[model samples]
Target chain A: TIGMIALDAQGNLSGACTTSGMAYKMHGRVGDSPIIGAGLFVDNEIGAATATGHGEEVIRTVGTHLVVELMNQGRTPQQACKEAVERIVKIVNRRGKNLKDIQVGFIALNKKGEYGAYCIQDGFNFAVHDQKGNRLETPGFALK
Target chain B: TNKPIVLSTWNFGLHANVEAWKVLSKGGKALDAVEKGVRLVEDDPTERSVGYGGRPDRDGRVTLDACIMDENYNIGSVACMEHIKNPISVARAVMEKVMLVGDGALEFALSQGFKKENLLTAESEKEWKEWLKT
Candidate 1:
């Protein structure tokens, strides 16, 4: 989808994504890439978040906000990141969401600029760039 | 203290065990151990199976992605960074910045001195050759 912006002006926040949704995605299909906190989020008082790939459940579950709120409450980004992903894993394992055998993933960021990504897949790849645009190691998966 | 043992593929090269054990024996920090051993993988062109040298993508460009998380859960990362080499440093910068979001994350990669663009053209084989000239 051709788009504009997804992160807020202050950075620790949410914005816009001008896209037609999914291409190969099934009806009612929504990955984290376009959802609110699941795909983008911000809180002027707290932190920000962004997610990518198969995050439909994360959107319904409010995964990004739940975790960032925790960070807002004083938890470390790692603690919140770990817990948020684990929550999704546990819910899916128990079939609590009723999505049925779907796979998904998400990534997040906090005010400190700390970031994390989680997925149903064994590992995920990510990229980082310096302010000057030097691509760093695409951050890999977070192993529990 | 409970030390978590990590057996990394890229760090130790051929003799992963001896190298990791040696680093552990020296009471090295987890990061220190990872650094000492990972260098082997990052520098290799033949270990392409694991470390470096993955025989460029269709574009014949070699881009790498990496991340380092401190004990506090702060994370730094890089993805498909080219020319400047070593994306891990960029990842760390993202974690250290005040802005925490999409472009913000990618900007850290640029802050390290590489040019920042959509990367679609950058990833194109045709573009890489032209980019090299500029």
Candidate 2:
């Protein structure tokens, strides 16, 4: 799934998420990527966040909004993203599921243009472009 | 002061960003830009992962899920919808209405004048048929 989040010059935060959902999923299954506060969240005063990966885990934690809220509570974008990934791992452990292959990632941008991302596993990367130039980088992950 | 910026997941987001930049460059509302941007991806038949021509479910039906949120926290969403080419637009329409799903969402789209077209492409159908054999 691809989820987009933006912070405009006016400090307005907005996000869009679209996906066909998991391949061969149950006919009526819907994932977190299309649910507000789960896959995407935008708060003009705070920041915005968008999530990808395991939609079920994202939905369970209201993932993206949680990242923005972490920013609101004074965490840096990177720190907030790290914490959000940790939260997902904690839940997975609590549920008795091994975190061997579950993948989830989140990207966040605050009003200051500060951006950060984290994922549950490697191989998940995001794109960034600005005065710095376009680049793709892997985010910090919770597991090896 | 920092300039406007956009962040998205994966490489495909790069293409979506191109459309979003058009709106942001003109000082348009981020909400409009995002909706417009995602719509482009939704319209592309080659992208098997989203919107029109997306991979279908086990039943050979292509269902779409989308959502849009603005700075004010206003939100709209549609899930498991079929035949609607742009679920994101319908999502924005829902922000002006209510979040909907399944037949109810499809009914709303029809009422709102969205045409029902076959979202299942021949390429996708070919793949689904192949999967059935396994």
Candidate 3:
């Protein structure tokens, strides 16, 4: 049996997210980005994450924890996401859950508290909302 | 999920609150914490298969990507990436050397700006073509 893991600290690794393969999902098509160590996070002790949605993106590329290590070694959240997505795009680009299935985004934070995230698809958007419930959109490709 | 972590075009930064938390937790060193977190997402191959033998996009290329932000949250990054691995680190450098971020990330190879070369050369193109042809 598998369980879920969530981390909290002045800054530690953690992961998870509500998903259904995009509203009209087959009612049971779980990608993996939200399945504990699978599509989720690992935290300060050496974290990992998942960017689900697209079947090919999520299924093929289902291990984000590695990216966290990359960040620790010197990479940004955007870089990590881009590299991961580019790696997937170069070999496997398919639109699955998210409209631009190719747009598999990711954000990584390492033990040192570093972070990064990226997407291969253009006009990407990862709206950032504050703890105060205020949402602010960050850099992303146009919705085109 | 940071606006559902949608795939619009540029959804690669950490959650703003997450970013703020890391910044505050790290004593308000935004870039340091920002870079640390983002890297975690990239190095992991299984998450996307581009690692060792996941599979290629329709093109079969092994594109690399990255992004970064300074203490002021001044951001800059590169995507649809290829060639250079550890792109996030590179993006951070770009921000350090300048003020305006984003597209400015494209400077020259070897710390240069963006170029006309296929960071993946022909690998990704071939993979895409093959996927489409077949």
Candidate 4:
């Protein structure tokens, strides 16, 4: 449920997020998705990232912002996404909760026009659009 | 004008994408496309996650959160805004002007001619009632 749009033409990128927010969540609860730094970030000089799932965890990690920054530091789209999910799993493991119980996924696009997605577990997928057409691409997993 | 890519977080983001395409294809700015795009989702009566039909808070009143950002790094958002149909649009206005939060944001929205309306839906109320049991 993450949307990342990359504009290679302008070297510009932007992301947006909206969610039901944790399914039966508190009425006033604001998930990481709508908060600018947590759910999504776009840096015309670097890249963009948007996240879905586990609002608390995403916020605790500042998930999407981290992914975009990693790109600025020279990580490819794939490496950045993996490391972001890896941070979540690292924390969840210490809590003695199964990583399988939670979901944290990210979609990333860098200035170079490369895109990648990753999650704490498998089954996280995203859509791709380009000159050829639209297609669905399943991202790699953090656990495996 | 070439269309700027618009992406939103949600399973049904494509619904908003359609509107974004319309704006972009017509030679609109990225900000215009982004704002108009999200308004589509905001206006949809059946989408229970955003705008009009979003799930209500503990008081059974629907409060919404939304934000808009541009390539220039400027962003604005409203949290726990009750009775506003399009928080995204309001957030855009916030970024365009002085930033405001909560009641001030509500006031700004009303000042801009955005009529007040109840955002809660019957389906969400039922869901809220169900959650109260747990």
The 10-residue segment with the lowest total lDDT in model 1 chain B: B1-10
**Highest lDDT scorer:** 2
**B1-134, model 4: which lDDT tens digit per residue?**
12244444444565666666665555556566657666777777688776776767676777676766677788776766767888877777777772455677788899988889877788888888988897
- Compose the digit string of candidate 2's lDDT tens values, residues B1-134: 46577777787777777777788777878888788777877898888888985999999999999998888878899999999989988888899865799999999999888999898999999998898899
- i-RMS for every candidate (Å) is 15.4, 1.2, 14.4, 3.6
- Candidate 3, superposed: residue stretches over 4 Å from native: A1-9, A47-52, A72-74, A93-101, A127-144, B1-134
Worst 10 residues of 4 chain A by lDDT: A1-10
What value of lDDT does candidate 4 attain over all alpha carbons? 0.69
User: Against the unseen true structure, what C-alpha lDDT does each candidate score?
Assistant: 0.41, 0.85, 0.39, 0.69
List fnat, each candidate.
0.00, 0.76, 0.05, 0.24
Best by DockQ: 2
Model 1 residue A88 CA deviation in Å = 0.6
Could you tell me the lDDT of residue A7 within candidate 1?
18
Off by over 4 Å in 4: A1-9, B1-10, B25-27, B98-101
How far in Å is the alpha carbon of B46 misplaced in model 2? Answer: 1.7
- Answer with 1 or 2, whichever has the higher TM-score: 2
Q: Give candidates' CA RMSD values in order.
A: 13.6, 1.4, 16.3, 2.9
Docking class of 3: incorrect
- Residue B4 alpha-carbon offset, candidate 4, angstroms: 5.2
Reference-based lDDT, residue A27, model 2: 82
Residue B36 in model 2: lDDT: 78
